[PDB]
Structures are given as C-alpha cells and as structure tokens.
C-alpha cells in the first residue's frame, strides 16, 4: 500500500510504498532487413496493375536512397552530463567496418535470430525481421507481369503494399529524427520482437517479468539508431534499458514554500526544502532523482534513470524525521517571495496560502469542504476532489492510500527576521545557521563599540587651567590647592 505523511513543520510530504525499476545500463542489439538490389523495371506499359506495382517499387527505391545518406553520418543543475546513445553508437560504428555486414548476413542465412561476435570481440544478438529481397526477387520478379508488362493479380499489388509498408515507415521515422528515434515504435520493433528480445537478454527472470509486463515503458526508454545500408542489408541498432536495480523501496518527497504570515506585504520570510524528488534504495545508499517529472510511475512501480540521479547517503531520510538533525545537513532555499501555490502529492495536496489569496478544498457533490488559513497546510484525498489556490483549480490524485498529518510548529517561526538570510538558492540548515550566527556577531561587536563610547567622558575645558574629575564633572584642581586636605584612607 501507498502511505503518505505531511510534515506541518517543514511544508513537505513523503509518499512511500513504491518499488523501483531503475535503468542502470544498456543492452544493444542489431536489427536487420534483407533488401533487393533492383534498380529499374523495364515495361512497355498500358496495364494498370503493373503501373501500380512500379509506383510501389519507386517508393521502395527512394526509401533506399534516403536511408543511404543517413548511413553516412530544484536540484537538477547538480547532475552530471551523460551521452545517452554512446553505447548504441559504438556498436553502430563497428558495423561500418568492412567485413562485419558479411558476417551478419552469413550468420542469418539459415535462421532469423543469431548471436554474432564482432571485430570488437563483443557478442551482440542479431535479428532479421523483414525479407523484402526474397519477396521482390522471387515473388514479384518471377511473376514480372510479362515482358509485355501486365501482371494478372490485384492481390499481388495489395500484398506488395503490405510488405513494403514497414520499410517505408522505418524510413520516415529515421528521416525526421536524423537517424535516431525514441521512443522505439512498433515499426522499428514489433511487440512480439521486443518480447522475444527481452527473453534473450542476460538478465534474471524477475527482470524479464518486469520488462515484459511494462513493454510500453521499455519502448519509451529505448533508442533505435540507424546504422548501415549495404550489401543488400539494412541494419540498425536498438538500445534497450537494463534495469539492474528493481524491487527496492522508493519514496517521493514533495515540498512547498513555508513563509511567515505577517499582515504587512513585504515583511515576511520564506524557506523551502529543495530536496523534492524521488528517492530509491540502491546498493546501501539512496539514488535521488531531483526531476521527479522525468520518472515514470506505473501503479506503485517507479521507472527512473540513474543518469538523472545523485548518489546520497541513507541518512538523507532523516530530513523527514527532524530537519535540524545532526546526521545530515538538510537542503533549503530562502526568499521573501510569499506567493501562494499548491503541490499535488500522491494522496493529497499541500497548500501554501499567503496574503489575500483565497484557498479552499472541495469535492464534486458537496462543493467547498475546507477553507485554508494563511500558512502552509495540507488535505488528504479522502472526500476531497479538487483544491483551489487563487485563480488555479487543481484536481487531486484519487489513488487509494492512507495519509497522516504530522503536526509541528512551522520552523520558519524559529528564525529572527532581522538576521535571516533571504537570498539563498542552494543553501542548507547549517549554512543558514552559520550566516545567522555571523550576523548576530557583527551586531554585538557594533553594540560593543557603541556601548564603549557611551561610557567615555568628554574633554575638559581648554582654558589654561588644570581639571580633575568629581561627580561626573570636570572641576578646577585649584579649588583643592587653596585648602589643606587630609588623607581619607
């Protein structure tokens, strides 16, 4: 089951109970199509069905030409930079080496599926999905009409259309994507071809189950890379995700700005947890995905790509226990921009309501159910269908689950607004604590100068006379030199 916790003290919520499916690697395979080296049909003419065949033939021929030139070819900023098709392109380059095509063609002479070990020494599965060479050379040009050019059967025209269609659509996809497509369409790889290819990958049965039960997601994370067309062979490399980490727990963190609620428009200070995103257990630490929108959620299964992740210690969850914990320095940003908004979570809605904004929650049959006050608040999806914050209506998720409201005082109340640093994009609890402490120390030091001069006494008169100090005034020394005094001790 999916459960959720809202933390009133930090304007954030955790949704948990999900299971991982992390793309950690790539699997590359070579897909081939056998082509005929037909150049031109010679015809006297006048027959409508031959004329129809020659049109389809010309579609085939410029599909070849077109393929022939394609052959001659908050915390997101902290992420690294990968090269997503480096693995597939590396295989593609090997295919351009002289000799490799021949070895693929021989390996696939008897069967349509063969494992071929290339110059690289790598071993990649190769598959033959369409044989237009055999169809054109043996089914169309033996029944070449006559040399009077008149085929007899309309069924042959329709059948050639059917078989040529896949090559045409593959050519179209490559021609508008500069030889690289994603997601991988059913023309590039039919649903049966992908399932049989999953059945051959070097993965556990659990990993085959998972991919086979989510082939639409597999397609979305895969690439088809046009490679070579030569020696009557069209070859392209499909690059499929390897889910090396599956079935580990994931949780999603949702965050929204937490501001003081003073009536004066510009007197308020704001704090927002910046560590929103997906979190999944992975090899003793946590993979953290800051662009949660780039992860793909299928029921309680979370498909994320480790290329879009940071590797964090397991203690990062302690920010959901106590944002001031000493084991992990929780990430926050600060500002004075107290605009209202909502964050729709897995099982509810965080509402940050500030200023004069009107903020409510409703359901479809009974209308308004809750009127929020200024501050950061939350409602679960039980009996709530929508929330409205200002001029924005939001539908909440209706997925079944249980939500817990964790009361706590908003931590923004703990800060002295005179020394609060309110311009930090990428800061943390301890970084803010330190700048607050430096500021308070710059303030006493000023108070110490001002308290010191406050106790200094002004200059005595400048009149040629000596002065001594008595009862907070300068008095003439001579006043005491006209009389005889006594030792008082």
């Amino acid at each position, epitope marked *: 089951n999916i459960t959720e916790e809202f933390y009133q003290s930090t304007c954030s919520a955790v949704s948990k109970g999900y299971l991982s499916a992390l793309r950690t690697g790539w699997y590359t395979s070579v897909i081939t199509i056998e082509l005929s080296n037909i150049k031109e049909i010679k015809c006297n003419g006048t027959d409508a069905k031959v004329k129809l065949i020659k049109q389809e033939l010309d579609k085939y021929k410029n599909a070849v030409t077109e393929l022939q030139l394609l052959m001659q070819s908050f915390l997101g900023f902290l992420l690294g930079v990968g090269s997503a098709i480096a693995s597939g392109v590396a295989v593609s380059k090997v295919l351009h080496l002289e000799g490799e095509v021949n070895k693929i063609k021989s390996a696939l002479l008897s069967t349509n599926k063969a494992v071929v070990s290339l110059s690289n020494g790598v071993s990649v599965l190769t598959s033959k999905v369409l044989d237009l060479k055999n169809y054109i050379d043996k089914q169309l040009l033996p029944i070449v009409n006559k040399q009077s050019c008149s085929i007899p059967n309309i069924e042959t025209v329709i059948e050639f259309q059917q078989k040529n269609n896949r090559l045409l659509e593959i050519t179209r996809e490559f021609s508008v994507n500069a030889g690289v497509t994603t997601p991988v369409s059913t023309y590039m790889l039919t649903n049966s071809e992908l399932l049989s290819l999953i059945n051959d990958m070097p993965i556990t049965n659990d990993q085959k189950k998972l991919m086979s039960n989510n082939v639409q997601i597999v397609r979305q994370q895969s690439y088809s890379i046009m490679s070579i067309i030569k020696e009557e062979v069209l070859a392209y490399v499909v690059q499929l995700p390897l889910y090396g980490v599956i079935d580990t727990p994931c949780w999603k963190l949702h965050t929204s700005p937490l501001c003081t609620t003073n009536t004066k428009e510009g007197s308020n200070i704001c704090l927002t947890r910046t560590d929103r995103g997906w979190y999944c257990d992975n090899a003793g630490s946590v993979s953290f995905f800051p662009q949660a929108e780039t992860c793909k959620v299928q029921s309680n299964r979370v498909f994320c790509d480790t290329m879009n992740s940071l590797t964090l210690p397991s203690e990062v969850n302690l920010c959901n226990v106590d944002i001031f*914990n000493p*084991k992990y320095d929780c990430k926050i940003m600060t500002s004075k921009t107290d605009v209202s908004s909502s964050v729709i979570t897995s099982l509810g809605a965080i509402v940050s309501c500030y200023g004069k904004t009107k903020c409510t929650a409703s359901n479809k049959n009974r209308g308004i159910i809750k009127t929020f006050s200024n501050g950061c608040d939350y409602v679960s999806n039980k009996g709530v269908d929508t929330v409205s914050v200002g001029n924005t209506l939001y539908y909440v998720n209706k997925q079944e689950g249980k939500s817990l409201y964790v009361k706590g005082e908003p931590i923004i109340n703990f800060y002295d607004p005179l020394v609060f640093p309110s311009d930090e994009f990428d800061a943390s609890i301890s970084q803010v604590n330190e700048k607050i402490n430096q500021s308070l120390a710059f303030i006493r030091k000023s108070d110490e100068l001002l308290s010191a001069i406050g106790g200094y006494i002004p200059e005595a008169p400048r009149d040629g006379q000596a002065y001594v100090r008595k009862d907070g005034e300068w008095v003439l020394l001579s006043t005491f030199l006209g009389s005889l005094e006594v030792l008082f001790q």
Partner: nanobody
Amino acid sequence: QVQLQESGGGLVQAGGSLRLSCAASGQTFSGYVTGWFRQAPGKEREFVALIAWSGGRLYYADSVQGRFTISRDNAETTVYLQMNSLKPEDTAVYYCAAKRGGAVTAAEWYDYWGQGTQVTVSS
C-alpha cells in the same frame, strides 16, 4: 529495504527485567526510524518506543516510559529495548519495525517488520 529479527524475549516474574534486541540484515538501520510494538492476545498492535539514529531523540508510549529504554548502537545494526519493572500487562508478542519518513507511532505507517518475540510476565 531492511530485514529485522527480534530476540531476547522470554518469561519473567513480575518486577523482573528483559532486554530485547532487533538485528538489521540486508542493509543497516541508518536513515530508518526503528520502532518497537507489542500485541497482546486479542488486542491490536500498539506502539511502545521509537528512535531514529544512535543517540537521537527517543519517544515512549505513556504506558512504558520511565520503565523501558530504547537505544541503537553506533554501527546502526541493532535496536535495543531494555525493559525493567515488568508487569503482567506487558505480556505480548513484541515486534521491531522500520520505516522511511518521519518518527510517527502509527503501526500502519511502518514498512518493515520482524516476526516478533514472546514476552510473558507472571504474577
């Protein structure tokens, strides 16, 4: 995901003591909230104590505090529950449990459970 295994239960006379241990396997407890729960025969699973890191803030149910002490070793591989001044009403199967998220007492919100160890306190 962490696996939990309780040990240290048994039968004691009233006023005696016991020490329960919960060992993590698969991964350590670091970053997990670990809670102790107990369930008497015909009663719902009820909260006893929780702790979130070695030497961190403790929480105890009103029925047990001043009598029970929860702790975790520095290596975060084991949670301990020292129970003193035991009373017959403390008789139950005791369960350790772990969760991501915050330090809450609701059993339904803990993701991972041990199989439990029997504690019996006689008159």
